[PDB]
């Protein structure tokens, strides 16, 4: 990817500025595998537009400087668990335009200095349970086009910092009972995080705010 820092190979390879961090471009080169050859002390490292189809668990081995990594547009269906537990530095994650269906348990867990984190246009059919309870620095949080039904109880209640939080077009369920949470906390939330209000109902024109939730409070799913 590259051939020392500054060193282009595969890959564009710029030095830190009085001003940029020491960034690694591979986006665009049409890359299956995440090459070897990325310098440990990488700040920024793109890896977008590309056809990975997985990652390597050993991939983002050394890398605890990153403070930035985007892995959008590329043929992931899977994330090893663990895999991002070593980047404790990232400030920015993106992971959009994949086809990712879960989420491994625990997988933000490490990067408690997550500010934006990047999940849309994938087909996630759930979240984990406490999946963002680490991530007490987030502003942003990205999960718009995906397969969500509903969120877990309590599933943003760390996210004390949010300030958007971009929901719509998930297949929300309004008639179960796991829908409640969601309805409430866009109700409460709505003033100071941004982007949840066109939260749609599955096959319906009835926005996720405007539920009546008495009424399916013991219809479960």
């Not at 990488?42 to 991939?59: D, F, V």
């Not at 625990?106 to 309870?133: C, H, M, W």
């Amino acid at each position: 990817a590259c051939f020392a820092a500054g060193k282009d190979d595969l890959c564009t390879c710029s030095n830190k500025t009085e001003s940029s961090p020491e960034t690694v471009d591979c986006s665009s080169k049409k890359l299956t595998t995440v090459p070897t050859g990325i310098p440990t002390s990488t700040e920024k490292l793109q890896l977008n537009y590309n056809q990975l189809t997985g990652i390597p668990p050993t991939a983002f081995q050394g890398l605890t400087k990153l403070t930035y990594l985007n892995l959008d547009s590329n043929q992931l269906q899977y994330l090893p668990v663990g895999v991002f537990d070593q980047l404790k530095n990232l400030n920015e994650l993106r992971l959009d335009f994949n086809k990712l269906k879960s989420l491994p348990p625990r997988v933000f867990d490490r990067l408690t200095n997550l500010t934006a984190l990047y999940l849309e246009y994938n087909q996630l059919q759930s979240i984990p349970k406490g999946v963002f309870d680490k991530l007490v620095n987030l502003e942003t949080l990205w999960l718009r086009e995906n397969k969500l039904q509903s969120v877990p109880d309590g599933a943003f209640d760390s996210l004390t910092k949010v300030e958007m939080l971009q929901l719509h077009n998930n297949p929300w369920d309004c008639a179960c009972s796991d829908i409640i949470y969601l309805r409430t906390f866009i109700a409460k939330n709505t003033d100071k995080i941004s982007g949840m209000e066109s939260a749609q109902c599955n096959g319906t024109s009835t926005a996720v705010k405007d539920v009546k939730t008495e009424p399916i409070k013991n219809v479960p799913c």
